Amino acid sequence: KIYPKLHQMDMDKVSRVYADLRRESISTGSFPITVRHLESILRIAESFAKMRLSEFVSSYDLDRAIKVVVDSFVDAQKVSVRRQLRRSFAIY
């Protein structure tokens, strides 16, 4: 049944918030940032919204969506990631 949809307005932040999530995340490892990886965050977002039964994307839906991805990408890093942890704090 339920088919969530984002409103492009508040979603602009993620394109901005992602910019933090690539280059700085690029700074370590190789890359391993992927174009596809960003596509996931939406498929991520769609889930919680239906779980919210909102029929459309909400910010709180993204709140998990980002956090789900953040440390997920983080843990892939070496023990040097403890340093990588501190920068991701801005994305929390």
Binding site: H7, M9, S54, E55, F56
Partner: protein, 553 residues
């Protein structure tokens, strides 16, 4: 305040010229009620072969951009839809020019109250008050004859109180809800009938023109069916077929429905996108959804059959359809659907409900197409206008099918976006009135057309309140996409469930004038329509607070 014929006869002496003519009909503006009356009149001069300009005015001040622009040899003039509120003597000025004046202006407006300056001070007018509300309306008599020309201190103080007495009286009039009386084409047809002409087309046009506001009550129209119904009696091409005939092939009365796209869509969605069906059945929700299907379970209708084209419905499904309606729809309060409103029959090209005929024309309005962009886009509406005027043409029906289809595209997003709004519960109940705003959505450009949210709001206001106790109320609406917070704001009024005891008119339009007479920052009366206004989101918030109070109603 004069008989139409002699006024029309008055143009006759002013008419034929080489180079002609010179008069110019004003097409003003968006509302279709003018459109029929233009063509009937358009055809009228065709009968006389009378040359003249045809101008689809849009901007309320655009005529000032025009009247102040092209007027040269014009010895006579006719305008439509405007002047019933604001004076062009102020708007144009005018400036009495040479008694036995060089130019005269017919002013078409169906809206009341008339401007105070309209009837009296006959100049270009030819005040259009005839023959609807004369009334009297003996109040305007004291607004001038008393007002004009207006121990001695007692008689002087006695006059002013009388002045304020009449001013106090005159203060109420002209401050009041602006409302249409009746479809102008009808009186024009009366003039058309006055000269004796009755064309099945022309009557159909009245049938067409009458249909224009039919989405909003009647209100007189309820008695105006028979006035047309008499005409269908006044005309009987033959006692019997005479099949088809291949040509005329003419209209007949039918059991019409508030049901939408009847012939032109699957009966299933026909309920689904029907607005009257919407709130009564609460169509957006899944709960009442099946209940309609339950009606097919009552109607004994196959779900796929509802998916089926109206063209191919079984003759059993056909003849029993209304009987099925007779045995079902009343249970749901759907009993007021069936209408005896007239239907054109093109035979080989098919019969059509004028109501359905209208909505296709309505689709032409918003589609089928710095500050210069709005004039550029409004021009597109005018650019898109004649294509709609082209849809007025009879032989050209094929083009109509685009709007016939596109109309189906409209409500699909219409029924779509609105219900999306329903989930968020964006209505502001406030206290004095129900209030809403659209801050966001896809394709607000399509929503830029007043009719877009207008059909929407009407689809909303009746949706949000059936009622839906208690107290049907006027709705607030706004929307924005681009052009720096234009936020078109169109007026909205409560709809009775087939039970308009009072006119109740309009308030906020005066109230919108209250704020435009107020600090009026970023608010724009640029809309020809009083109900609709442009506003910045920046200044509308206080405009809202200014709108919330003072409430005029």
């Amino acid at each position: 305040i004069s008989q139409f014929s002699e006024a029309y006869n008055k143009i006759l002496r002013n008419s034929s010229s080489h180079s002609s003519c010179q008069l110019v009909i004003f097409v003003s503006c968006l509302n279709i009620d003018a459109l029929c009356a233009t063509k009937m009149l358009s055809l009228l001069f065709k009968k006389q072969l009378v040359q003249s300009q045809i101008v689809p005015i849009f901007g309320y001040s655009e005529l000032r951009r025009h009247y102040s622009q092209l007027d040269d040899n014009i010895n006579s003039l006719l305008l439509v839809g405007f002047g019933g509120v604001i004076d062009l003597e102020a708007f144009l000025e005018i400036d009495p020019q040479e008694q036995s004046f060089r130019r005269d202006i017919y002013v078409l407006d169906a809206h009341r109250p008339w401007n105070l300056d309209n009837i009296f001070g006959s100049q270009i007018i030819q005040c259009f008050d005839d023959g609807t509300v004369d009334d009297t309306l003996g109040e305007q008599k004291e607004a001038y004859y008393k007002l004009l020309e207006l121990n001695d201190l007692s008689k002087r103080k006695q006059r002013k109180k009388q002045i304020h007495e009449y001013e106090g009286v005159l203060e109420e009039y002209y401050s009041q809800g602006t409302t249409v009386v009746n479809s102008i084409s009808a009186q024009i047809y009366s003039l058309l009938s006055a000269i004796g002409e009755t064309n099945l087309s022309n009557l159909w046009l009245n049938i067409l023109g009458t249909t224009s506001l039919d989405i909003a009550y009647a209100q007189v129209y309820n008695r105006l069916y028979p006035l047309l119904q008499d005409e269908v009696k006044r005309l009987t091409p033959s006692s019997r077929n005479s099949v088809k005939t291949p040509d005329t092939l003419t209209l007949n009365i039918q059991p019409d429905y508030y049901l939408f796209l009847l012939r032109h869509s699957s009966l299933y969605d026909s309920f689904y996108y029907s607005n009257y069906v919407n709130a009564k059945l609460s169509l957006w929700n899944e709960n009442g959804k099946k209940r309609l299907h339950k009606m097919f379970a009552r109607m004994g209708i196959p779900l796929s059959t509802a998916q089926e084209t109206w063209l191919y419905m079984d003759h059993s499904i056909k003849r029993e359809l209304g009987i099925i309606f007779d045995k079902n729809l009343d249970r749901y309060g759907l009993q007021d659907i069936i209408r005896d409103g007239f239907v054109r029959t093109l035979g080989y090209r098919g019969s059509i409900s004028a109501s359905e005929f209208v909505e296709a024309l309505t689709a032409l309005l918003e589609v089928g197409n710095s500050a210069q962009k709005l004039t550029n886009l409004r021009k597109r509406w005018v650019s898109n206008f004649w294509l709609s005027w082209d849809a007025l043409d009879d032989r050209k029906v094929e083009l109509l099918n685009r709007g016939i289809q596109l109309a189906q595209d409209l409500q699909r997003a219409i029924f779509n976006t609105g219900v999306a709004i329903l989930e968020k519960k964006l209505i502001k109940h406030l206290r004095i009135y129900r209030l809403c705003v659209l801050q966001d959505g896809p394709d607000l450009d399509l929503y830029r057309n007043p009719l877009t949210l207008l059909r929407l709001g009407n689809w909303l206001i009746e949706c949000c309140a059936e009622s839906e106790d208690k107290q049907l109320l006027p709705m607030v609406l706004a929307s924005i996409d681009e052009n720096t917070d234009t936020y078109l704001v169109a007026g909205l009024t409560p709809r009775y469930p087939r039970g308009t005891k009072k006119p109740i008119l309009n308030n906020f339009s005066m109230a919108f004038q209250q704020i435009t007479a107020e600090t009026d920052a970023k608010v724009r009366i640029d809309n020809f329509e009083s109900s609709i206004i442009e506003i910045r989101r920046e200044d509308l918030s206080p405009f809202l607070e200014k709108l919330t109070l003072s409430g005029l109603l």
